[PDB]
Amino acid sequence: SHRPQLEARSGAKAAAYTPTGIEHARLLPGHTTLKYRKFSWRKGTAFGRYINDMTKSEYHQEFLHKHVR
C-alpha cells in the first residue's frame, strides 16, 4: 500500500537528464569571493537532633517534576 524506502533515487538518472535552465533563489551568487589562509522548643519534634541515560539524567527527572504540576 504505502512502503518504506530501500533503493534511493540515484542521481544517475538526474545526470543523464537534460538541464532545466531555471534560476533558483539561492544559486544567485552569494559570497562571490573566497577567503584564504596565511599560507527547648526544637526538642519536642518527632525528629529532634553523571549517567548516560536520557531517562535517568538529574536534569531530566527534575524537568519532568517541574513540567507536570
Binding site: 524506502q5 530501500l6 533515487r9 518527632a46 536520557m54 531517562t55 535517568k56 527527572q61 513540567h67
Partner: protein, 201 residues
C-alpha cells in the same frame, strides 16, 4: 525533473526516520554473514520498528529468536533515536514556555511525547521502589505512627465507622456526590460512551 526537496520542519521527522532505518539496515547487512536478501531485511527493519514502539511503551523488547548482536545493535539505534526524541521534546517545552511560534499540531505532539516520557519515568520509579524497598525507613514509619497515635490520643477522636443503614443523612450524602458528578455533565451535551454510562448510573 531533479526536484529534490529539502528538509523542512514539516518533513523533518519522516526524513530522519528513513535515514535511521537505512543506517540500521546497512549495519545489519554488514553484520549478517550469509548476504541475505532485501526481503529478509524487511523482517529486520519491521523488527526494529516494533522495538521502537516497545521502548515508547516501556515494555522491554525481548524477542527470543534473535542473535544477540542484532539485539544489541537495535538497542543502540533506538537509544540514539530515543535520545533525539527526548531532547527534542525538552527543547519544544522550553520553546512553548517562551511563547514562540509553534505549530498547534506540534504542541499536541510535544504534549503526547512528554506524557509518554512522564509515564515511562513514573513506572521506572515504581520499578525502582520495588527493586530496592520503600524509601521510608521502618524506624521512621514507626515514629510517624507514634506521632499520629499520640495526636488522636490527645484529641479523643472517635474514628469514622463503616457506614451502616442507620443514617438520616445517607440519602442527603448520596445526593451531594451525584450532584457533583452531574456538574461535569450539565455543560457538555455531546458525551462519550463512558460518560453516557456514568450518566445512566
Amino acid at each position: 525533473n531533479e526536484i529534490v526537496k529539502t528538509t523542512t520542519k514539516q518533513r523533518l521527522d519522516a526524513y530522519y526516520d528513513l535515514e535511521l532505518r537505512n543506517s540500521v539496515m546497512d549495519d545489519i547487512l554488514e553484520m549478517m554473514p550469509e548476504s541475505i536478501r532485501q526481503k529478509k531485511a524487511r523482517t529486520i527493519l519491521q523488527h526494529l520498528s516494533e522495538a521502537w514502539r516497545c521502548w515508547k511503551a516501556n515494555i522491554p523488547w525481548d524477542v527470543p529468536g534473535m542473535p544477540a548482536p542484532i539485539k544489541k545493535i537495535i538497542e543502540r539505534y533506538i537509544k540514539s533515536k530515543a535520545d533525539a526524541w527526548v531532547s527534542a521534546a525538552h527543547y519544544n517545552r522550553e520553546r512553548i514556555k517562551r511563547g514562540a511560534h509553534v505549530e498547534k499540531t506540534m504542541v499536541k505532539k510535544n504534549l503526547g511525547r512528554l506524557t509518554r516520557l512522564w509515564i515511562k519515568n513514573e513506572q521506572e520509579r515504581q520499578r525502582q521502589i520495588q527493586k530496592n524497598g520503600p524509601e521510608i525507613t521502618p524506624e521512621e514509619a514507626t515514629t510517624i505512627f507514634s506521632v499520629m497515635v499520640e495526636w488522636l490520643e490527645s484529641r479523643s477522636f472517635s474514628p469514622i465507622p463503616f457506614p451502616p443503614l442507620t443514617y438520616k443523612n445517607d440519602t442527603k450524602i448520596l445526593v451531594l456526590a451525584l450532584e457533583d458528578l452531574k456538574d461535569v455533565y450539565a455543560s457538555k451535551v455531546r458525551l462519550n460512551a463512558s460518560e453516557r454510562e456514568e450518566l445512566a448510573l
